């Protein structure tokens, strides 16, 4: 086509989606990770995660307001990944890298799994 | 913080949100523009438009499944702007610029209004 493109549009959209999440506006699901609960937008979770994409395209699970993750999932690792979904920024540290990588593998977030593998390989 | 950032994350999220729109997945509103209907995600419309942000933060309108726009709004201009919201690409042409600018002013999409004003000024 002959379209023009606004370079900062995708980033501005994601910033506003994160502002809606922070104010709990139009959040339609709560993700339960052991004793912890995280409110989010199903569309953003699907757009970021192969696992959530599979869950919310399922004809019965698409209607659930609560999703319980596997008990082996670490709440902090999930929190870090949820923040990444809404911001593009990943808080990867020596103390959380193993939990973040395991959570990213479970959530099917291949670019996160990739950077965790590379950061671990460099420390070996 | 000491976060790392994935450059293509925001663009990848928006691409997936557009794929969900194309397959009518988790769309929660229909925008009526005279004889034409457009399905969308309320969160994306709010993230892109000052008008939709005001509508869907309203305690009664947040629950509506149908929103009717002002009869002066051109369906093609709306279609072009809805495509821009979900892609960052604006199909701006001599034949649609006036309708696109008027629709962007109504929807409160200031960056679109700005490029339309500049393109019009150059042709004068």
């Amino acid at each position: 086509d002959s379209c023009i493109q606004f370079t900062r549009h995708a980033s501005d959209v994601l910033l506003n989606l994160n502002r809606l999440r922070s104010r709990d506006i139009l959040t339609d699901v709560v993700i339960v990770v052991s004793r912890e609960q995280f409110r989010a937008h199903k569309t953003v979770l699907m757009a970021c995660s192969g696992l959530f994409y599979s869950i919310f395209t399922d004809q019965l699970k698409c209607n659930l307001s609560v999703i319980n993750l596997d008990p082996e999932i670490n709440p902090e690792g999930f929190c870090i990944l949820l923040d990444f979904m809404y911001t593009s920024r990943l808080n990867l540290r020596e103390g959380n890298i193993m939990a973040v990588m395991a959570t990213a593998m479970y959530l099917q977030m291949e670019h996160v799994v990739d950077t965790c593998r590379k950061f671990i390989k460099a420390s070996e | 913080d000491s976060c790392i950032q994935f450059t293509r994350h925001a663009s990848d999220v928006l691409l997936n949100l557009n794929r969900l729109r194309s397959r009518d997945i988790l769309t929660d509103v229909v925008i009526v523009v005279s004889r034409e209907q457009f399905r969308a995600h309320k969160t994306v419309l709010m993230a892109c438009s000052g008008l939709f942000y005001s509508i869907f933060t309203d305690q009664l309108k947040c629950n509506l499944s149908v929103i009717n726009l002002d009869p002066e709004i051109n369906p093609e201009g709306f279609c072009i702007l809805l495509d821009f919201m979900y892609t960052s690409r604006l199909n701006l042409r001599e034949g649609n610029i006036m309708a696109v600018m008027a629709t962007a002013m109504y929807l409160q999409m200031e960056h679109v209004v700005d490029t339309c004003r500049k393109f019009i000024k150059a042709s004068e």
Partner: peptide, 4 residues
Amino acid sequence: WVIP
């Protein structure tokens, strides 16, 4: 704005 750019030519993509």
